[PDB]
Amino acid sequence: MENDKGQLVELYVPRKCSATNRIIKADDHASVQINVAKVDEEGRAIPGEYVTYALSGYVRSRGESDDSLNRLAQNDGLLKNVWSYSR
Amino acid sequence: PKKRASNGRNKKGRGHVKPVRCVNCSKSIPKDKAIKRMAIRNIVEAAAVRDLSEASVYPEYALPKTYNKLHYCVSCAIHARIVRVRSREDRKNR
């Protein structure tokens, strides 16, 4: 939130899930942050560079966390043919 | 409070059945509600077949078994120790 002069009021602008856009609550102790290492040419991971994926607690509880992760992985190019939009 | 999903016993979609009679105290109970135990016991008691075999005409081979179905009321089944109470978790067990 902002006031009239433009400085940013309200603290800790919260994160959102990468599958279904929803604010991750502070006490929502069911949401994990998936980190994927980046390979480059030689086939070795480069420490420090990660592909950050966030999944909310509700998606994990449903059991669609695996389905969502492959969709994001395939969309960003991590995986190739593990997902099918026209199921 | 409610105890079982099947309130009396095994009746969902009928509404009414022909009742049966208990074999012990002659109590009238619904056929579904009654607890039935089948008796497959032999016509002779435990052991004693060898005594029968020696005094048996023909090469034995008879060994008849009596078959009977017994219907017990809730009061008689518990009293006769045929049906015993269980815990709430064990109640759901079939």
Binding site: M1, V13, Q33, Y50 | -
Partner: protein, 216 residues
């Protein structure tokens, strides 16, 4: 001495994490009441009441005291904790620790002029604990916290300057209505107000970047 056990305790003691916001942002679990007081040194305590609870035994009762303690500074943080103990003072001491461990932040807002500082709540938020429901409707400036004295004190330690309140059910149960009110100020960030719609990069967890100062 503290000798923290958790990774978060080691990080805050070493001085790596200097704000409670990072833990709130990353939803890092914490069970160490040193962590909360170190990052929030202006942290106060206010006990509503002590209600004994009795369990019947073979010979006499086993009277124990139940105390409700609120922990929270008046600028955006609040926490609640309930614990039973044989001694009333021990229950209060344990209640402070639990309420410290259950410190939650607040999303303040305005009834609206986009002019000053966040006084009321951003949206309407309610929480239910048993049968009691507590509605927190935003209120104009100068209205104040119109509610029961217990929840008014809890909201005054949460940083809210003005709000509207509605309650339904057996509100006389103080513990239930406190927790129900606590959930109400806990779901404020849950609401997705259209201002928080722009996409942002996901921050890397502090533990991942500070794994060197972890364990051993």
């Amino acid at each position: 001495g503290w000798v923290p056990v958790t990774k978060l305790g080691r990080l805050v003691k070493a001085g790596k994490i200097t704000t409670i916001e990072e833990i709130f942002l990353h939803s890092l679990p914490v069970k160490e009441f040193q962590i909360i007081d170190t990052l929030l040194p202006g942290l106060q305590d206010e006990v509503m009441n002590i209600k004994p609870v009795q369990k019947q035994t073979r010979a006499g009762q086993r009277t124990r005291f139940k105390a409700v303690v609120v922990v929270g500074d008046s600028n955006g943080h609040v926490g609640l904790g309930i614990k039973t103990a044989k001694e009333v003072a021990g229950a209060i001491r344990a209640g402070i620790i639990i309420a410290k461990l259950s410190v939650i932040p607040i999303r303040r807002g305005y009834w609206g002029t986009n002019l000053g500082q966040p006084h009321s709540l951003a949206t309407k938020t309610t929480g239910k604990c048993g049968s009691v429901t507590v509605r927190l409707i935003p209120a104009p400036r100068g209205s104040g916290i119109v509610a029961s004295p217990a929840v008014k004190k809890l909201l005054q330690l949460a940083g809210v300057e003005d709000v509207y309140t509605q309650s339904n059910g057996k509100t006389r149960t103080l513990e239930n209505t406190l927790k129900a009110a606590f959930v109400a100020i806990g779901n404020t960030y849950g609401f997705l107000t259209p201002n928080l719609w722009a996409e942002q990069p996901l921050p890397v967890s502090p533990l991942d970047i500070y794994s060197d100062e972890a364990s051993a």
